Amino acid sequence: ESQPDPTPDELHKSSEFTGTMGNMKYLYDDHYVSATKVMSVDKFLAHDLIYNISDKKLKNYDKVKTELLNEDLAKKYKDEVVDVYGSNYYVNCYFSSKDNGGKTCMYGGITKHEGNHFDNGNLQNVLIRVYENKRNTISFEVQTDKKSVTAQELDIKARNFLINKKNLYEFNSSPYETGYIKFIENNGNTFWYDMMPAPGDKFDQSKYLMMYNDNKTVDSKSVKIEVHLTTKNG
Ligand SMILES: [Zn+2]
Numbered sequence: 460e461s462q463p464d465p466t467p468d469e470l471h472k473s474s475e476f477t478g479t480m481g482n483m484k485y486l487y488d489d490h491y492v493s494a495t496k497v498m499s500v501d502k503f504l505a506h507d508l509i510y511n512i513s514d515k516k517l518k519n520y521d522k523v524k525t526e527l528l529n530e531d532l533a534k535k536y537k538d539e540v541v542d543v544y545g546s547n548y549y550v551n552c553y554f555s556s557k558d559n560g561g562k563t564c565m566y567g568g569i570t571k572h573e574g575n576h577f578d579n580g581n582l583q584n585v586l587i588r589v590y591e592n593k594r595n596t597i598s599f600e601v602q603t604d605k606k607s608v609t610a611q612e613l614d615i616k617a618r619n620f621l622i623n624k625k626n627l628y629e630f631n632s633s634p635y636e637t638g639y640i641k642f643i644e645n646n647g648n649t650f651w652y653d654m655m656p657a658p659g660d661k662f663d664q665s666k667y668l669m670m671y672n673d674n675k676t677v678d679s680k681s682v683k684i685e686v687h688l689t690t691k692n693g
Pocket residue numbers: 495496541542571572573575576
């Protein structure tokens with residue numbers, strides 16, 4: 460059923476990462492694609508959808524391609540009016556079938572608009588508990604207007620806060636050696652994401668963000684979230 464917690468040896472270690480941690484920071488530091496009530500207009504590969512979404516803030520794009528885990532998911536949302544929220548990238552973002560106004564790429568992040576908001580139009584607060592070397596040091600809330608929200612949206616908001624509050628990611632490296640965010644649903648199901656880059660000297664943004672392609676959603680009103688960091692080295 461649910462995924463078992465991380466084994467000690469499998470968590471990515473920042474000490475084994477030789478690239479620029481700033482490239483991971485970029486993906487979560489006040490960085491995200493957002494849109495409401497849109498419908499896809501085109502496709503590239505069988506598992507993706509293309510939307511006309513403009514970079515409101517910093518005019519960097521007018522088109523967005525989101526890749527999904529499979530062809531079924533893409534077909535399911537193809538003609539639906541949806542809301543979008545996710546972390547985008549530009550390096551190795553591929554479009555056109557020889558040819559096929561900037562463009563940007565991302566994974567998952569879509570939810571149906573209809574019936575997915577709160578009656579009183581208020582926002583739902585989600586508590587995030589932070590653990591450092593097995594100690595709950597701080598806890599804070601992030602918000603969403605969606606009853607059923609993607610795990611990606613909640614993750615992004617949580618890391619954005621920790622970047623500023625705890626300097627989660629810096630340009631050169633990170634004060635933490637290990638890190639993973641865990642979700643606990645009200646039906647008992649659990650799952651987690653590794654918050655550190657794979658070992659080596661070159662961070663692959665596209666490959667990392669791919670973990671969101673399942674378009675996983677959770678009930679904002681009842682889900683629990685825990686961030687587990689260690690400085691177990693230094
Ligand atoms: Zn909506």
